[PDB]
């Protein structure tokens, strides 16, 4: 557990208040199990809803892999993400499940494939998907404030970070102790940022500053 209070005192810094974040006040319970299938937007084509399997769980997050794709493009979503739903959600809403961009077979093999993977599949029940947290009405972050942020280049990691700059609804996230290469702009509504102390509360590892 990272000592945020000692860290904020020594850097003469404030953590961004919880009201800045589109995150729940308390980290949502994660009742997903490895092997459970669900529906997720394909990160490599966000127009597509695809079948994903939980291949890992960490705190309130799921490590997801699209069935029929590859093991090199796994992605992480919170259990209260609006980009994941129970199987059947897409159809109920007038849509059609799609092959993943990285589908390992040819496209005419898709309809048969879906039948095969869904047959006696372990499926995440709709009740374990958590409600979408309220969002702030505006960007309330201020330059200099610290927070916990996903390293988008190594998304298993959530790390000590600082708001470097602000432009309207976008905040600039920089990772304490790391070269500016891991920096990124995101919307203040990002699900990839958390108030200080959130990881410890959710049982997710939280990376201390880098040694540079
Ligand atoms: C924590 N995060 C901001 C940086 C992670 C970088 C790890 C990588 N293997 C490296 O050593 O470059």
């Amino acid at each position: 557990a990272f000592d945020w209070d000692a860290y904020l005192e020594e850097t003469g810094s404030e953590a961004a208040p919880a009201k800045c974040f589109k995150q729940a006040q308390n980290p949502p319970n994660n009742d997903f199990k490895i092997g459970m299938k669900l529906e997720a937007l394909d990160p490599r084509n966000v127009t597509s809803t695809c079948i994903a399997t939980v291949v890992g769980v960490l705190g309130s997050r799921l490590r997801l892999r699209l069935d029929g794709s590859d093991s090199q493009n796994d992605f992480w979503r919170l259990v209260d993400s609006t980009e994941i739903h129970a199987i059947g959600h897409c159809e109920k809403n007038g849509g059609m499940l799609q092959p993943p961009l990285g589908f390992c077979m040819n496209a005419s093999s898709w309809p048969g494939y879906l039948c095969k993977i869904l047959n006696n599949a372990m499926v995440a029940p709709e009740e374990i998907f958590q409600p979408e947290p309220p969002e702030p009405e505006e960007n309330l972050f201020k330059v200099g404030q610290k927070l916990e942020a996903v390293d988008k280049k190594n998304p298993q990691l959530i790390c000590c970070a600082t708001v470097d700059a602000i432009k309207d609804d976008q905040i600039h996230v920089t990772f304490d102790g790391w070269r500016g290469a891991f920096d990124y702009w995101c919307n203040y509504r990002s699900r990839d940022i958390f108030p200080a102390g959130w990881c410890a509360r959710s049982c997710h590892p939280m990376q201390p500053p880098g040694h540079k």
Side-chain angles (χ1 to χ4, degrees), residues 150-151 153-154 157-160 175-176 178-179 182 207-208 210:
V150 178
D151 176 2
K153 303 177 93 176
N154 296 285
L157 310 176
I158 298 173
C159 325
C160 189
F175 293 84
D176 300 20
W178 295 95
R179 54 202 188 276
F182 300 97
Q207 307 307 127

Side-chain angles (χ1 to χ4, degrees), residues 44 63 65 69-75:
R44 303 151 72 184
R63 185 182 174 147
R65 178 175 304 156
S69 73
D70 57 65
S71 67
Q72 299 307 301
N73 288 278
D74 289 356
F75 58 104

Side-chain angles (χ1 to χ4, degrees), residues 22-165:
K22 186 167 180 168
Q23 298 297 350
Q25 300 184 258
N26 304 309
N29 283 178
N30 187 342
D31 288 312
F32 287 77
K33 301 308 181 203
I34 286 155
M36 272 177 184
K37 297 202 192 296
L38 49 312
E39 301 180 350
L41 286 189
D42 185 351
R44 303 151 72 184
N45 190 4
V46 285
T47 65
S48 285
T49 304
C50 301
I51 295 304
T53 302
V54 179
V55 295
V57 171
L58 195 66
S60 295
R61 304 208 292 158
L62 307 168
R63 185 182 174 147
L64 298 170
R65 178 175 304 156
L66 305 176
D67 291 64
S69 73
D70 57 65
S71 67
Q72 299 307 301
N73 288 278
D74 289 356
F75 58 104
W76 293 81
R77 298 290 178 267
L78 288 151
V79 290
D80 66 11
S81 173
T82 59
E83 312 209 336
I84 63 164
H85 297 92
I87 287 154
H89 181 262
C90 186
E91 173 178 5
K92 167 183 75 98
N93 289 110
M96 207 114 292
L97 292 169
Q98 300 291 318
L101 190 88
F103 191 48
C104 68
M105 310 203 156
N106 87 126
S108 62
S109 292
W110 176 251
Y113 192 85
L114 203 238
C115 290
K116 277 232 66 147
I117 65 165
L118 286 192
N119 197 13
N120 200 208
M122 180 183 329
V123 313
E126 73 179 0
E127 56 263 33
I128 68 166
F129 290 84
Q130 299 292 347
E132 175 200 358
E135 69 184 53
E137 267 164 294
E138 56 179 29
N139 188 355
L140 264 17
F141 289 100
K142 301 294 176 204
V143 169
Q145 287 176 334
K146 297 185 177 298
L147 49 71
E148 297 168 1
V150 178
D151 176 2
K152 290 181 172 185
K153 303 177 93 176
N154 296 285
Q156 191 173 135
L157 310 176
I158 298 173
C159 325
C160 189
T162 305
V163 173
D164 223 48

